Design a protein around this ligand. Structure first.
Ligand SMILES: [Ca+2]
Ligand SMILES: [Ca+2]
Ligand SMILES: [Ca+2]
Ligand SMILES: [Ca+2]
Ligand SMILES: [Ca+2]
Ligand SMILES: [Ca+2]
Lengths: 779, 779
């Protein structure tokens, strides 16, 4: 079953039926004001901090996704009413036709019902901290129609906790006041004239309004049947205390075929509402704002475009996965329909990894997040697991430290400089979170040295998940994954030091890497099963062996052994063959197998998790891309693509009855074979899977990699591919890459010509604005 | 307008119309399992800790109070369905007749609709950690009817925060399994076989069941129209992960006039469900359990009964206010429809005050809370503002200390011993929260000494509310109220030391009290306005003077000046006359006047609060009873009763359109004259107003006071009262008190006779089980 389709021409996902088994969401905003909106217009907005500056409310994890940003239409001759979004009124789908088009930073809602055509486009314009509701109403009937429009948003008390609890305080913390076409919401305890005021305005001069939620909705009614909408007029309520809303109403008389256009604006700050309601009265200003949003992504998408034999890959890489990846980098991981309170700010390992994905499209935000992470690192070398970047924008101990967080930052910083050429970044002085300062280069060495220190007696990095927090504590237990990650970070740093001429560091870290490789190859390989173990308990018992009954094969250790470059080709192929044989499924690769069924605290919390769920036997998406990278390094492009196709949401567009979640977004995890809901995808949007998937496909399958001295093209594709084409923008120059595979191999470059001239090695960075033809022949 | 009436005979409040403007709630449970339930069956249950052991979910502060404990009935011949409680199905009130009877620790729901009579009694039986749903269905039509019943509860993830957020974890933290007539809910991460398991069972053998919320309710539906109920059968769902519910269904065939009875049981712990569903199959066991709940309160109510000319006073004192007061002592202040997360445990000043109210009815719980408070006190002498008694059941600094918390404990402990005669309690060794131990007596001296130390240069106690937390910080600013409270606590302690023969302490604290009185009479009286000021800013500016434009007269300082016994009769009368003239309203006494309109941090956060709201000009209920006590000490019974009648919820039974909240419960505050909603009552049930109101009426208006050596009867009533009667149980003996007022005075005892013999002074404690006639003649 399917509920929509991909519109490649307009870069939108079209939902043709609104009764989807779950809310399919989209993100509005590219700067500070953000809105998480569903195909049923359910959702909320926040400014900068989802935890402390929520703008409109949200009652999560319920059968309905309310409240939202709704527009109710009413036929004043009959009293009939409906919403432009299907919910909350939920007019019969046998009577009304709904369509939702989720685009990049905008969502279009459409409803055709009983002679009235209505469209509503929600988007956050660049340059403003507000959301525009561009509404168009057309009378498609043969008679004069009188239609009233009502907006609705329930204003938040700003702190999520204040919306969820402590109402003894929050119910008396705000008030509403009215001025022509503007409901002004005052957070009374927040004296900042900007952050302490919200508003809902209309470009039309209202006939009525409501600032009190209980008056608009009415007693024993909810968003599905507001009293104001039913009776055809608001109560013109506005007062201090209790729950507030932003409802503006206007009646329109439409001749047959006549259409009208107007807008509502939800925003923050005194003075902005009166200004924008006037500004957008000239619809040309709305169109101009929308055009800027289209341009924003056109510019980004154009920096990497691919044309290959795989339509699913092309569709996702050329738009959706880039979009999801950058969304993570810009908005972080704590504002969705799943993350709705508590954790806020930046997760160290999450953003460190996310930031490696789109420096080619958004270098400024990538640099910002990297600086945030460097500022969130302590002198010891590790990073604060969870912190608010605003804290350090001009601290926990080793017990709460997660052994891998800081290491992910190394490859990411190296990639950022490779991409932008900002080599001076390494000399920039950045303060440590716990006092003092050091250059970016030294921050990096502090991270590498930390992991070299925190190892066991056999030379393996400490790290094991004891509690329910996905954190590799240092309280006992060694992790194969951390050692492999350390090796990878070391290889990256070695290349850097070599490029910078830091001979002393080259020797130091080459030696360190050498010791890591020897220790891993000696202690982590299981020659009975033919794979790498997950690690060892604090008592020295190997976890992930061929002799154990549960948790024998682990995805993370085996994929990273190869991705890092530590594993030999021989062990790499066998380990990945075990991954394929024991972990592959039509929905993607399982994290481990068999699932754990016996609680064992020496192994970790994973033994206390349901089978086929989360860390215990589920298809955890994040590590899947690592398997693709591993396969490309082994030269098995067909194997890599088998894995890619299985996880690609695009290919599951017509199995929603099983997947449930959005077919345009990667999710945190899919229920594994051991759970009765095997196949159901959970937690779309804010997952590191998107950044890694984008990175894996662009840099390893398609094989396009920026470097310190040149651009490399070394693809690993399915042998049956006749070739493919990529448009890559790097350091201000364009590279039109054409890959030819006449001998039908998977990997191996026979020749590369730059502008008609054969070259050997990487492509040197060309002049600013230059357009270069690059022909790569595999063989 | 009214929505019900008081049924004095059955000690229940009868709601005859369910479309009340707000949820009118009741509390089920007397031991550890508690349920906050509304007249629409909305609400939730928790075990011991509302924060960490919630049993069923609750979506607060919304237009509907859901979810709840619902029973849906369906006519299987027509497909029509409705709930026994009006909501959530909300059958037209022109078609169905609903009645709800809230009783002491039980609630009866009734629905008469289209030939079917149904009753549902919810109550938590003593001895079990569960809630019984006693259901009776009767066919009152002239034809055979086939009716199906469905239960519904949405199981909580136990931690309130886990229900509200962090679903990335909680959605995979539980599961359901089914056994005949029992849905077993497993909190997977809680290994305790008792606390880590909930259940919903039925005495009947089910025809179908549902453990998955999404299957019972169905897609794009909610509690108002469950798919299972509409289709007439559950889907027999049960699995791990996602949201769970407890739905058991059974179809019944009823002959005309035939009725059936069965029960659902919501509870905690493995093994209990199978046991209780079987136990209650014999309805006699349900009746026996209900009888125990009636007995529980019959015993308590009988210990103090009054018959006076004031029906409102009698109705409330004989049942409702005692009930509300004891509810606060037993369940604390953090579980209602307003307090739904965050703060949990015990508020020091809240419980210290609450515990003075019902030692005559529940001495065991009173003693327990007193010990909790003593354990929550630090060596320095102050108490932890908010703490969990379980923490100390076998710490903040002076910056987070609230200057009055510990002082309230003194009069409360003295009262407890006076009431029970447990003089040995003073010698009991109790550990301080921050290490070490001392006798109860010494704990008390530590509190008194602390306040003597933390005073200003003029001798007034430090204390002023700087932030939004109702805490009198010691960071600068002096409080009249704290000094008066200190004096009151000192007078109480002096009487104690005198009784115990501690001459040295008698001299020490008499001297301390003397200094407090001199300092207050010298610096806190405003001879221009004729009242006591609120206090002084850290800069020495008096707050609450006749010359100021805002916040001139304050209720707390003026009432306590008299209640404490510090103020002279002359200043007392004038100060209280100012209270009457400037603060009295038909809804009760305002906290201060005029309201503040200019932010002034030297004065406190009150200057940043909306006018007529909370601390700034609202009718804050808590201090109102202090005014009654003050008036009785001044001998003005008519004035005291004017105040009592104005705040008494009972007298507002027919002005619900203005009051909104329950007419049987005191609330935290009523909107003041300065707010447009003046008259609206906010936050019923968990307010110290109930304990203080009970204490004020029983001990001061009716004037019955237990003492260390005898029982005192010194009433202060309206002059037109011909007299009144009280039945008082004290230390195992009964005192049948008859007060005669032939000369129509307000206060002053001419004579007192004990069992026919005239006596002078207090009534000596009589023999256990004795019944004594006490005749008091005023004159
Ligand atoms: Ca404000
Ligand atoms: Ca510096
Ligand atoms: Ca160019
Ligand atoms: Ca359990
Ligand atoms: Ca001891
Ligand atoms: Ca007796």
């Amino acid at each position: 079953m399917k509920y929509g389709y991909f519109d490649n021409d307009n870069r939108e996902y079209v939902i043709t039926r609104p009764d989807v088994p779950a809310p399919w969401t989209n993100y509005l905003g590219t700067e500070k004001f953000c809105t998480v909106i569903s195909h049923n217009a359910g959702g909320y907005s926040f400014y900068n901090s989802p935890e402390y500056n929520r703008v409109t409310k949200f009652r999560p994890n319920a059968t309905f996704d309310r409240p939202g940003h709704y527009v109710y239409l009413r036929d004043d001759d009959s009293g009939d009413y409906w919403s432009i979004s299907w919910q909350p009124v939920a007019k019969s789908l046998d009577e009304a036709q709904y369509q939702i088009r989720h685009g990049l930073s905008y969502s279009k809602f459409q409803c055709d019902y009983n002679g009235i055509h209505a469209r509503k486009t929600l988007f956050v314009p660049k340059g403003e901290d507000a959301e525009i509701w561009d509404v168009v109403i057309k009378n498609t009937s043969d008679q004069v129609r009188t239609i009233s429009a009502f907006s609705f948003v329930e204003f938040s008390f700003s702190h999520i906790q204040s919306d969820n609890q402590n109402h003894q305080m929050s119910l008396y913390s705000a008030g509403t006041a009215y001025r022509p076409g503007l409901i002004e919401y005052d957070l009374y305890y927040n004296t900042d004239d900007f952050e302490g005021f919200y508003y809902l305005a209309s470009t039309f001069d209202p006939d009525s309004y409501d600032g009190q939620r209980d008056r608009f909705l009415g007693l024993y009614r909810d968003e599905a049947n507001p009293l104001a909408v039913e009776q055809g007029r608001c109560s013109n309520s506005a007062q201090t205390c209790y729950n507030h809303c932003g409802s503006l109403h206007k009646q329109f008389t439409l001749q047959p075929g006549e259409e009208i256009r107007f807008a509502y604006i939800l925003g923050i700050g005194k003075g902005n509402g009166e200004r924008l309601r006037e500004h957008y009265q000239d619809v040309a200003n709305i169109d101009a704002a929308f055009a800027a949003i289209k341009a924003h992504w056109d510019e980004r998408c154009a920096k990497f475009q691919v044309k290959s034999p795989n339509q699913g890959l092309d569709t996702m890489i050329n738009a959706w996965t880039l979009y999801q990846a950058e969304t993570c980098v810009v908005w972080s991981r704590f504002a969705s329909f799943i993350e709705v309170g508590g954790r806020t700010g930046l997760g160290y390992r999450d953003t460190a990894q996310d930031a490696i994905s789109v420096p080619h499209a958004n270098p400024e935000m990538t640099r910002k997040r990297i600086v945030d992470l460097l500022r969130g690192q302590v002198k010891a070398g590790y990073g604060l697991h969870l912190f608010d970047p605003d804290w350090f924008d001009p601290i926990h101990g080793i017990k709460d430290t997660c052994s891998d967080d800081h290491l992910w930052l190394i490859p990411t910083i190296c990639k950022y400089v490779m991409e932008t050429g900002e080599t001076s970044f390494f000399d920039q002085m950045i303060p440590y979170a716990d006092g003092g300062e050091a250059s970016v280069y030294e921050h990096m060495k502090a991270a590498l040295d930390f992991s070299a220190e925190y190892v066991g007696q056999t030379g393996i990095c400490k790290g094991l998940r004891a509690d329910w927090n996905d954190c590799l504590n240092l309280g006992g237990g060694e992790s194969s994954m951390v050692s492999f990650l350390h090796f990878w970070a070391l290889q990256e740093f070695i290349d850097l030091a070599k490029f910078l001429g830091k001979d002393q560091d080259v020797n130091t870290y080459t030696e360190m890497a050498a010791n890591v490789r020897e220790a891993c190859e000696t202690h982590l390989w299981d020659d009975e099963g033919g794979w790498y173990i997950r690690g060892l308990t604090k008592n020295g018992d190997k976890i992930g062996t061929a002799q154990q009954q549960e948790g024998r094969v682990h995805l993370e250790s085996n994929t990273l052994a190869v991705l890092s470059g530590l594993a030999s080709q021989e062990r790499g192929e066998q380990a990945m063959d075990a991954v394929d044989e024991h972990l592959f499924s039509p929905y993607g690769l399982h994290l481990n197998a068999p699932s754990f069924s016996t609680p064992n605290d020496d192994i970790g919390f994973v033994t206390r998790v349901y089978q086929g769920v989360k860390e215990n036997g589920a298809i955890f998406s994040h590590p899947n891309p690592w398997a693709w990278v591993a396969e490309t390094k082994l030269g098995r492009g067909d194997r890599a693509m088998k894995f890619y196709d299985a996880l690609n949401p695009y290919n599951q567009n017509d199995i929603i009855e099983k997947r449930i979640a959005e077919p345009y977004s990667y999710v945190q995890f899919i229920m594994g074979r051991d759970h009765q809901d095997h196949g159901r995808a959970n937690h779309p949007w804010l997952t590191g899977t998107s950044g890694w998937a984008y990175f894996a496909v662009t840099n390893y399958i398609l094989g396009v990699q920026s470097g310190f001295t040149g651009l490399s093209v070394d693809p690993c594709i399915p042998s049956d591919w006749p070739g493919f084409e990529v448009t890559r923008q790097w350091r201000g120059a364009t590279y039109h890459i054409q890959v030819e595979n006449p001998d039908h191999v998977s990997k191996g470059v026979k020749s590369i010509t730059l502008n008609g001239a054969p070259i050997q090695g990487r492509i040197p960075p060309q002049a600013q604005g230059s357009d270069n033809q690059v022909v790569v022949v595999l063989g």
